[PDB]
Nucleic acid binder design. Structure first.
Ligand SMILES: Nc1ncnc2c1ncn2[C@H]1C[C@H](O)[C@@H](COP(=O)(O)OP(=O)(O)OP(=O)(O)O)O1
Ligand SMILES: [Ca+2]
Length: 430
DNA sequence: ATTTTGACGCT
DNA sequence: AGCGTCAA
């Protein structure tokens, strides 16, 4: 009752760029705009592996992970843009720089947590309070929410997409209580107004479109964001949670898309997030551990307490290359050459990072996969990163991994290496 | 033969 | 530390 927390204390948004790498390439090359297209890495093997797909191409069934030759079977007119290759490997610099463009715009509005290259969480609580004081009881017009969906609406007593959106927005605003500056629903609505403004600024200043979710915590904001892509935003209110969760597969909730979510389904014999409400906190803790159990107990009721972390820059800078099938590195000299290529890219990015962000990495992490091991990483070792020097970093990585080689003749490498990974970590101010 | 990335938890 | 999970 009067002491039961409802997790309505914050306004949190999750901005997710639409088909991001595709949009970067379409901005650069207008011939690709409004076409079925995709972004591919490499080209020799089966036309290259697709890593991003425009919505026009998705309509044909083109997906990520697909080989371009196979995506051409579904979409013969598919256009392609290739990731730049440098030093013998794919180089993602263009997309990292476009990400900085968007993150810097978002940072003008609020503190952001960079979740990935094209996703950021925004804590809008303070900005919403300020805007509510400015509005000073004035109602919120539907014109201020031109691309917003209210999840769950319309309901109760037009066959067009936009018609449904406006019809739902009207019901929401009609019911909204603008008197109460502390009303969580009003706070979310003002949050959505601010996110419309943020998304307009991103599109104006970069050309890039995005989707967004607005709710009371990060998990609901992420879920909301995915409900109406592309180029739309969705408000998930606390009151919308029971219906929304009643048919929501557990795997759709962030962190439950893998083994833990599978175990929740198998152990409890349920399918949907809402069914979790029927277990006590101690029951969930008994099956999934103290932390996961408490998290699930609150999350299935719409309550998540994870903060939006004040962090705009990545905490690590890494470079990796796979060596699949017969191309696995089987000689020592070969291993050293690829470590040098990786270390040269890493040096370049680290030097730029140091100049831009006033920080220095202090640890180098070296990871490898051996041919036959199914695990993503077979071995991980660290050494000091004391100089931004590609020859030194590559020599040091070799030093830390050279004893993994079983071959009695050093010139040969066995078992063959199927992946090399260098990552700079543990930044200190400089 | 998806590849190339980040962030965070466990012991 | 080194390994594993989950996600762009
Ligand atoms: N598995 C992957 N491997 C390599 N790059 C990836 C992978 N997944 C995503 N990316 C890249 C390319 C994407 O443009 C970018 C953002 O990813 P993601 O948000 O999942 O999809 P997306 O932005 O392309 O489409 P959407 O509109 O559905 O968000 O990160
Ligand atoms: Ca995206």
């Amino acid at each position: 009752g009067p002491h039961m927390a409802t997790g309505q204390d914050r306004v949190v948004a999750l901005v997710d760029m639409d088909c991001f790498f595709v949009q970067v390439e379409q901005r650069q090359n207008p011939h690709l705009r409004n076409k079925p297209c995709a972004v591919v890495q490499y080209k020799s093997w089966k036309g290259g592996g697709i890593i991003a797909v425009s919505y026009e191409a998705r309509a044909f069934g083109v997906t990520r992970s697909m080989w371009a030759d196979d995506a051409k079977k579904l979409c013969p007119d598919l256009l392609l843009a290739q990731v730049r290759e440098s030093r013998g490997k794919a180089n993602l610099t263009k997309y990292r720089e476009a990400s900085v463009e968007v993150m810097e715009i978002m940072s003008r509005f609020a503190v952001i947590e960079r979740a990935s290259i094209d996703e950021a969480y925004v804590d809008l609580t303070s900005a919403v309070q300020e805007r509510l004081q400015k509005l000073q009881g004035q109602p919120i017009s539907a014109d201020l929410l031109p691309s917003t969906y209210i999840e769950g609406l319309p309901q109760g007593p037009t066959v067009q997409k936009e018609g449904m959106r406006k019809q739902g927005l009207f019901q929401w605003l009609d019911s909204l209580q603008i008197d109460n500056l502390t009303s969580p629903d009003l706070q979310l609505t003002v949050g959505a107004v601010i996110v419309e403004e943020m998304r307009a600024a991103i599109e104006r200043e970069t050309g890039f479109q995005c989707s967004a979710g607005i709710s009371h915590n990060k998990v609901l904001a992420k879920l909301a964001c995915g409900l109406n892509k592309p180029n739309r935003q969705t408000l998930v209110s606390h009151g919308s949670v029971p219906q929304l969760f009643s048919q929501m597969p557990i795997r759709k909730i962030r962190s439950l898309g893998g083994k833990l979510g599978a175990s929740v389904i198998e152990i409890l014999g349920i399918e949907y997030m809402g069914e979790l409400t029927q277990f006590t906190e101690s029951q969930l803790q008994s099956h999934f551990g103290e932390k996961n159990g408490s998290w699930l107990y609150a999350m299935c009721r719409g309550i998540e307490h994870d903060p939006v972390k004040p962090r705009q820059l990545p905490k690590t800078i890494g470079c990796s290359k796979n060596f699949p099938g017969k191309t696995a590195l089987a000689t020592r000299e070969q291993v050293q050459w690829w470590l040098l290529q990786l270390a040269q890219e890493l040096e370049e990015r680290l030097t730029k990072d140091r100049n831009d962000n006033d920080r220095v990495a202090t640890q180098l992490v070296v990871s490898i996969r051996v041919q036959g091991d199914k695990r993503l990483s077979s071995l991980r070792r660290c050494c000091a990163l004391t100089r931004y020097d590609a020859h030194k970093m590559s020599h040091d990585a070799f030093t830390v991994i050279k004893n993994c080689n079983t071959s009695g003749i050093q010139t040969e490498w066995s078992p063959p290496l199927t992946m090399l990974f260098l990552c700079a970590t543990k930044f200190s101010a400089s």
